[PDB]
Amino acid sequence: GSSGSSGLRPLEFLRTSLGGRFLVHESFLYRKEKAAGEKVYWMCRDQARLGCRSRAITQGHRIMVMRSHCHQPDLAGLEALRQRERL
């Protein structure tokens, strides 16, 4: 569990096989689309499956959300993706 109040909040990430690294935010999963040098654009990995166009921006140790999500988070599926990472 993670509970606390601070201006600069941390951020979680993930690493998958040939494809790049994932981003954990709002109990969801995103993929690094592009990088503006100092900024890194992401997109809900469920953009091809759940037709989710929800994008976000990561900077330093924080994160940002552009659009919303048309689907619900699956703590069950998200954890199954972290296991293959912590091993």
Contact residues toward Zn ion (CB under 5 A) are 44, 52, 54, 69
CB-nearer residue toward Zn ion: 48 or 80: 48
CB-nearer residue toward Zn ion: 38 or 79: 79
Q: 30 forms bridges with which residues in the sheet?
A: 23, 44
Largest CA distance in the chain: 36
Give me the sign of the Cα torsion angle 10, 6, 64, 78: positive
State the minimum distance, in angstroms, from the CB of residue 78 to Zn ion: 12
State the minimum distance, in angstroms, from the CB of residue 54 to Zn ion: 4
Q: Where are the alpha helices (DSSP H) in 1-87?
A: 75-83
State the minimum distance, in angstroms, from the CB of residue 17 to Zn ion: 22
CB-nearer residue toward Zn ion: 51 or 60: 51
